[PDB]
Amino acid sequence: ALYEYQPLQIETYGPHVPELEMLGRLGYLNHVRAASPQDLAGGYTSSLACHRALQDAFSGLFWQP
Amino acid sequence: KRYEKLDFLGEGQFATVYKARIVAIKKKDGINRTALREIKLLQELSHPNIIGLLDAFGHKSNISLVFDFMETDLEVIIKDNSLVLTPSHIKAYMLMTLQGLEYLHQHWILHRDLKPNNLLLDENGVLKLADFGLAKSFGSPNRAYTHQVVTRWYRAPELLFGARMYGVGVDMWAVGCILAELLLRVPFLPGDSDLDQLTRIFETLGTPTEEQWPDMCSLPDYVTFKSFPGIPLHHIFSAAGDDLLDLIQGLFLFNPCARITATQALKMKYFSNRPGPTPGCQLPRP
Amino acid sequence: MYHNSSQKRHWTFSSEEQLARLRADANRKFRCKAVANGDPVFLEPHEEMTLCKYYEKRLLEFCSVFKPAMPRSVVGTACMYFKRFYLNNSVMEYHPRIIMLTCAFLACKVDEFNVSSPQFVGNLRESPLGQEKALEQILEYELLLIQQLNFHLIVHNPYRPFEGFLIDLKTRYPILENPEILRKTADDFLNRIALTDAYLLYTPSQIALTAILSSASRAGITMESYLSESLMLKENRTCLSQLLDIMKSMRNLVKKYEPPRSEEVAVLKQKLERCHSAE
Numbered sequence: 001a002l003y004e005y006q007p008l009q010i011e012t013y014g015p016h017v018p019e020l021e022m023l024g025r026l027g028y029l030n031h032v033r034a035a036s037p038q039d040l041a042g043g044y045t046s047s048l049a050c051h052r053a054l055q056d057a058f059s060g061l062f063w064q065p
Numbered sequence: 066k067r068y069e070k071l072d073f074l075g076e077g078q079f080a081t082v083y084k085a086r087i088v089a090i091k092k093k094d095g096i097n098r099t100a101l102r103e104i105k106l107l108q109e110l111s112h113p114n115i116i117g118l119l120d121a122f123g124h125k126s127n128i129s130l131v132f133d134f135m136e137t138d139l140e141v142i143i144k145d146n147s148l149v150l151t152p153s154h155i156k157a158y159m160l161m162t163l164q165g166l167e168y169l170h171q172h173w174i175l176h177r178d179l180k181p182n183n184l185l186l187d188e189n190g191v192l193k194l195a196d197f198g199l200a201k202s203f204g205s206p207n208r209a210y211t212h213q214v215v216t217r218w219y220r221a222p223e224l225l226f227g228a229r230m231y232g233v234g235v236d237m238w239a240v241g242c243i244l245a246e247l248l249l250r251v252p253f254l255p256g257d258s259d260l261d262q263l264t265r266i267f268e269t270l271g272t273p274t275e276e277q278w279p280d281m282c283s284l285p286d287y288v289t290f291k292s293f294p295g296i297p298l299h300h301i302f303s304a305a306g307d308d309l310l311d312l313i314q315g316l317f318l319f320n321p322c323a324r325i326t327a328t329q330a331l332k333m334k335y336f337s338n339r340p341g342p343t344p345g346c347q348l349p350r351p
Numbered sequence: 352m353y354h355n356s357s358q359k360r361h362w363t364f365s366s367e368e369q370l371a372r373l374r375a376d377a378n379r380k381f382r383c384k385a386v387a388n389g390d391p392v393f394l395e396p397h398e399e400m401t402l403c404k405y406y407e408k409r410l411l412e413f414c415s416v417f418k419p420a421m422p423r424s425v426v427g428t429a430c431m432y433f434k435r436f437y438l439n440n441s442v443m444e445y446h447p448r449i450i451m452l453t454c455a456f457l458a459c460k461v462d463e464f465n466v467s468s469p470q471f472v473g474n475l476r477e478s479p480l481g482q483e484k485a486l487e488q489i490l491e492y493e494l495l496l497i498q499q500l501n502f503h504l505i506v507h508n509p510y511r512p513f514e515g516f517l518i519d520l521k522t523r524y525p526i527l528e529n530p531e532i533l534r535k536t537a538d539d540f541l542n543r544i545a546l547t548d549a550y551l552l553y554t555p556s557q558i559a560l561t562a563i564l565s566s567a568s569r570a571g572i573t574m575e576s577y578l579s580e581s582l583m584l585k586e587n588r589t590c591l592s593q594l595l596d597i598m599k600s601m602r603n604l605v606k607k608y609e610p611p612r613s614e615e616v617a618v619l620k621q622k623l624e625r626c627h628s629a630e
């Protein structure tokens with residue numbers, strides 16, 4: 001009946017990726033290109049690119065065929 | 066082939082769809098880029114609220130795509146005067162759409178064509194996002210998009226201002242428009258043109274300011290409008306509850322970054338409060 | 352994402368022996384259909400490998416001079432398409448020139464690198480009649496390539512994992528003071544890896560990490576702490592050992608790579624031309 005949220009349990013076979021909103025306070029965003037005012041107006045932030053890059057770096061790193 | 070054609074379902078400038086033994090087949094530049102987009106995206110996605118590409122085939126430069134047969138869509142549900150959309154049904158449709166969208170965004174894909182006729186319903190009352198012909202991956206800085214995506218009635222103001230770079234906010238704004246359509250049984254913002262779409266947006270929700278949208282003036286096609294006050298949300302949706310109104314406000318935030326994501330929308334109290342979403346077998350069938 | 356992708360589910364293979372079995376199967380099937388449709392002209396699987404390597408280098412040369420500039424993801428997707436297609440197909444049936452051009456065409460379409468057919472074929476160093484013929488051949492082979500790829504078009508390349516690893520090194524590995532000094536050599540090793548079969552045997556994240564760590568070792572830097580501490584693999588000894596063995600195997604594949612010889616390529620080119628002129 002009543003719904004309760006549960007995060008998507010998807011196995012990445014790699015190291016844990018820090019949360020998106022967390023990236024700025026861990027220093028990740030200091031190494032990615034800053035979003036332009038046009039990009040930020042459109043809703044694009046450097047955190048998105050950083051998060052995608054980290055997820056792809058960690059995806060399947062521990063996987064064996 | 067292995068498919069015996071059963072019935073005609075539709076056609077258009079792009080393709081035609083037939084029910085076939087039960088599946089639905091959608092049939093110098095080479096293979097159509099829309100079909101290639103749909104194939105390359107739906108092969109990498111698997112979720113109960115995303116349409117499943119079971120098979121693909123064809124000949125020469127032609128191609129056909131095989132999907133699960135879908136009984137109806139949200140457009141038919143909304144347009145049906147006999148159907149009564151209870152709050153539970155609205156919550157169920159909203160929940161299925163948002164779960165599919167959360168899965169899609171988690172894999173860095175924007176649908177970019179969300180509308181009631183792209184949310185298809187099967188015999189078991191399971192909603193699936195379909196028509197991935199405009200869907201595209203996001204998160205890459207070196208990838209310029211176009212602002213002429215999403216049907217105008219569901220297009221976000223950032224798109225209507227020419228945003229080359231955007232995120233999940235376009236899909237979330239379309240989702241808010243779909244929710245408004247579900248509540249009002251009519252399209253929320255029927256603009257006859259891009260300028261009129263912006264005018265209706267600003268006349269219903271108020272003209273955004275610098276505090277509501279810090280960099281709105283930096284968009285290439287930003288146009289200054291009258292200082293509309295906007296209609297109060299509870300005035301527009303008189304039957305909506307406080308949690309539903311909070312969800313609507315989150316979906317219609319002018320700032321795309323501040324606009325609620327699918328995860329945040331799913332975590333909102335609206336989906337946790339009573340009554341729960343109506344189960345699929347009890348959803349109204351038009 | 353890679354961890355639930357078709358590349359991992361269907362196009363990452365256990366061993367080089369499995370790939371050799373697939374290629375030998377393709378060669379044997381073509382031989383049986385050729386002797387059932389009508390000889391030293393037949394190509395051996397290793398000759399097919401030499402030809403496939405030569406034409407993958409030709410595909411790289413085509414993509415490098417392509418106008419407008421070809422994104423590296425498109426080139427990687429096209430090369431992966433070439434490798435996947437000739438896993439299960441003989442060059443004696445479908446000529447690698449047309450297949451590599453079709454791979455580039457389909458990669459441009461799939462990666463969303465918008466290029467019209469005339470400007471695609473205008474990059475070929477042939478006459479307009481030859482360009483038209485090549486375009487017609489590409490259009491005829493596009494659906495064949497898609498079918499042979501099993502309709503698995505999204506290719507995960509190690510470039511963005513490489514970017515993510517560099518970001519992680521900059522953020523959480525101050526011992527490596529400037530990770531940017533591990534970019535040129537790491538990308539050179541990434542290209543060397545791409546020359547081999549590693550793209551069919553290892554994950555893109557593993558390939559990127561192997562390239563970065565090989566670059567570090569070439570620089571005299573030992574980031575075993577990065578794996579043990581930053582990647583927390585010191586909490587899982589078996590996982591760290593498995594990863595280290597994966598990188599060692601990738602390096603072994605790289606060092607054992609043998610470029611095709613020009614004279615051997617010429618002889619096998621004559622053999623391939625004779626094969627296509629027959630049947």
Ligand SMILES: CC(C)c1cnn2c(NCc3ccccc3)cc(N[C@H]3CNC[C@H]3OCc3ccccc3)nc12
Nearest residue numbers: 074075076080081082089091132134135136137138195
């Ligand atoms: C995943 C897709 C391929 C799919 C799966 N099932 N299914 C169905 N089932 C039947 C049905 C009946 C009523 C309401 C919804 C569904 C229909 C349908 N299309 C048609 C429905 N409304 C008009 C037409 O759509 C425009 C159109 C036509 C041709 C080509 C492109 C667009 N598509 C699908």
